Amino acid sequence: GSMNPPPPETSNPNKPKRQTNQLQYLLRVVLKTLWKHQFAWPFQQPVDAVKLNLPDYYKIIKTPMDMGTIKKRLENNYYWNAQECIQDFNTMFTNCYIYNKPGDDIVLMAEALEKLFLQKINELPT
Numbered sequence: 722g723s724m725n726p727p728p729p730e731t732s733n734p735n736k737p738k739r740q741t742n743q744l745q746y747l748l749r750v751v752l753k754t755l756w757k758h759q760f761a762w763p764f765q766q767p768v769d770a771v772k773l774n775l776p777d778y779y780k781i782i783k784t785p786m787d788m789g790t791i792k793k794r795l796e797n798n799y800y801w802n803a804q805e806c807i808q809d810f811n812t813m814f815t816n817c818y819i820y821n822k823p824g825d826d827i828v829l830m831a832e833a834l835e836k837l838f839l840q841k842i843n844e845l846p847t
């Protein structure tokens with residue numbers, strides 16, 4: 722039998738909170754721009770491997786990540802360091818490359834989203 726894992730942790734009220742220029746930009750500019758992209762829809766929520774009939778997905782992908790989780794982590798002050806958020810974006814793209822094969826449609830879609838991501842964090846404020 723095949724079940725999805727619970728989604729990643731997005732909220733811990735015991736974690737210290739800070740507002741930074743970089744976390745605000747990651748939510749208001751970067752997340753916003755990737756969310757509205759033509760290719761965002763597969764990445765907006767956890768992979769539902771039951772719904773998609775892919776019982777091997779959570780056999781291969783042990784560090785799941787998606788933009789819906791990253792949005793909640795940003796808005797709930799889950800991240801202390803901007804690099805934690807940048808790591809989650811990179812995990813989301815590399816999961817797609819790990820599960821799938823070079824040249825697959827979803828890989829071309831993730832590669833384009835990654836290119837936009839790198840252009841947006843090129844302008845990460847200081």
Ligand SMILES: Cc1nnc2n1-c1ccc(-c3cnn(C)c3)cc1C(c1ccc(Cl)cc1)=NC21CC1
Pocket residue numbers: 762763764768769773775816817820821826827
């Ligand atoms: C991410 C992510 N990494 N690998 C995948 N995915 C997806 C995740 C979600 C969905 C989805 C479907 N219907 N809904 C409501 C969500 C689809 C996919 C697709 C996928 C394939 C082709 C295109 Cl053109 C687009 C997507 N491939 C997989 C499962 C292997």
